[PDB]
Assembly symmetry: C2
């Protein structure tokens, strides 16, 4: 069946410390009796805080965007071994190419980290019918520096960039397509055993309502919630991974 | 002639305080001999530090969000008089509509803040010939919640969203084209006076090599440097406004 689910919260800067605070308390008070791996990603400025307050047993802490070998080392020593790389806004605003992103992922994985790699196409990419070539080009970049063994440390997060504030809305059905597309290349390129236990999270707009239908999809193994999607309702999202 | 220029650095959390600290030092050490307004906008977290380390007479701190009377009040009391609203990242990832933005802007202005409002179209919009409709719409929204007097606290920052991580590259001429369009509307919609004094900042990829050229345009009044464009060479950018 499906590998172990993953419910990750991608927190960022223009979000308050109090906001981050309240959330952590919520998570702590929450009961999770099912097999799921929760994750709280955070920028550098909050790593210390969430590290000191997050106590839920089904939760782990993760960093975002660490590339430098020294930076990695610190994280490891600081007690953080999960990292989110290749987010849409990183590629767009920080000019993080498939290459740059590939380099990072390899570094992190070498440092013994658990990586969440983000990939996705934009509106113009989809429109022009470049969806396949695009997503595949990305995944290929990454897979170019990993060994078959390294994959056990990799998590894929599909980002429907084409639906990020564009007005477009990705139906649960469309997501499945992307995920299925991704899982194929893997099974075909890396191996079946690999594609089998590989996690493919949905990094689109999710909520309490759609989280259920979304998850009932064959190739959907979790979520990467962020932006305006990140709210107390996150709790509901966790539960949906049943 | 041209109105007083503005050189705004838009700092965001994905980048340690060290990078920020280092930057402040640079800025504090720099010598600016001309009439120019420098600004360092930062996310919540580093607001305190920035305020505690920044000492250059030509600089000012700036927040990046809210309209909540409380938030504004606090900021105002904290010693922050500038604020940045409507950034592409916000409208896209945080679901900030033309109305939300317009509201915020109205709040800040009422609280006696100096506002930097971001407007700009996407690749799809431009490719679809929506450029004029879009930007004009955006600005119209802001304008409708203001009075002729409020404009003195308004600063427009044009974001070539279509040029951000798309492969496309905007030219100083394509910019002047956009800036010229914006100013025109303001001239006929609000008044020549307003239009004449109105500051319009180019908020796209810029460096030490193109800065001067960009500033050479007749409708370009400064810069809103952020993301990868945010390097120590920001100093060069300031000089390009000479």
């Amino acid at each position: 069946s499906k590998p172990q689910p993953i419910a990750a919260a991608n927190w960022k800067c223009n979000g308050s410390q109090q906001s981050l605070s309240e959330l952590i308390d919520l998570f702590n008070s929450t009961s999770i009796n099912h097999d799921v791996q929760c994750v709280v990603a955070s920028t550098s400025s909050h790593l210390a805080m969430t590290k000191e307050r997050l106590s839920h047993p089904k939760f782990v802490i993760a960093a975002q965007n660490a590339g430098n070998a020294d930076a990695l080392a610190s994280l490891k020593d600081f007690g953080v071994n999960w990292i989110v790389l290749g987010h849409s806004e990183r590629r767009a605003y920080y000019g993080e190419t498939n290459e740059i992103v590939a380099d990072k992922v390899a570094a992190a994985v070498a440092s013994g980290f658990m990586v969440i790699a983000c990939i996705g196409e934009t509106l113009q990419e989809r429109e022009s019918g470049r969806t396949a070539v695009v997503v595949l080009t990305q995944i290929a970049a990454i897979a170019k520096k990993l060994k078959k063994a390294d994959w056990a440390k990799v998590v894929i997060a599909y980002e429907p960039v084409w639906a990020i504030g564009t007005g477009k809305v990705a139906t649960p059905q469309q997501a499945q397509e992307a995920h299925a597309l991704i899982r194929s290349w893997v099974s075909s390129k890396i191996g079946a055993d690999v594609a089998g236990e590989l996690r493919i999270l949905y990094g689109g707009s999710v909520n309490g309502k759609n989280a259920r239908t979304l998850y009932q999809q064959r190739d959907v193994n979790g979520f990467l919630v962020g932006g305006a999607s990140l709210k107390p309702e996150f709790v509901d999202i966790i539960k949906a991974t049943q």
